[PDB]
């Protein structure tokens, strides 16, 4: 695939610096869907402004496991059948957490987003479209941890 090369080499950018790029992408989620904000609850408490959750050394955390998992699909970008039984975990444990199977394409706007800041005149449409792909994949196997 001509893809799969576009998604290598945009990530190798990205992950450079991967807690300041998924800095990003939560910044424009929240700004998108505010009401995802408290569907974080470290330690009982909700975040009261998405600024709040940059302090949190638990969100940051979660940053990078967010970049992690998407590293790992990248890295299985030729074939993404390997993560599927880990994705339907990872689903069904985001269920619980209460996102709902709509707010994943908000998720897939903000990590467009962070990627056309990041590449500027590097994302290019195939760009666009090979990560888009990429990310449709991981979703619905994602929402396979959903059938209940
Ligand atoms: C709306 C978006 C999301 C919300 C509200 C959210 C929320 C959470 C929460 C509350 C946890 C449990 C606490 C923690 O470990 O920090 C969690 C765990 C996790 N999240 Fe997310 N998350 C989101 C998106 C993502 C995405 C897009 C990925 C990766 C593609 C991701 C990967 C993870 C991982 C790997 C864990 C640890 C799961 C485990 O093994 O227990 N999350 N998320």
């Given at each position: 695939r001509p893809e799969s090369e576009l998604i290598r080499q945009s990530w190798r950018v990205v992950s450079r610096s991967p807690l300041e790029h998924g800095t990003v992408?939560?910044?424009?989620?929240?700004?998108?869907?505010?009401?995802?904000?408290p569907l974080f609850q470290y330690n009982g408490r909700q975040f009261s402004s998405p600024e709040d959750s940059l302090s949190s050394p638990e969100f940051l955390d979660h940053i990078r496991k967010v970049m992690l998992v998407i590293d790992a699909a990248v890295t299985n970008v030729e074939d993404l059948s390997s993560l599927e039984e880990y994705l339907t975990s990872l689903g069904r444990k985001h269920r619980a957490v209460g996102v709902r199977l709509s707010s994943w394409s908000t998720v897939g706007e903000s990590l467009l987003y962070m990627l056309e800041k990041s590449l500027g005149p590097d994302f290019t449409?195939?760009?666009?479209?090979?990560?888009?792909?990429?990310?449709?994949?991981?979703?619905?196997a994602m929402s396979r941890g959903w059938d209940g």
């Open positions: 992408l939560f910044a424009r989620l929240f700004a998108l869907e505010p009401s995802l904000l449409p195939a760009t666009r479209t090979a990560w888009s792909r990429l990310y449709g994949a991981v979703v619905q």
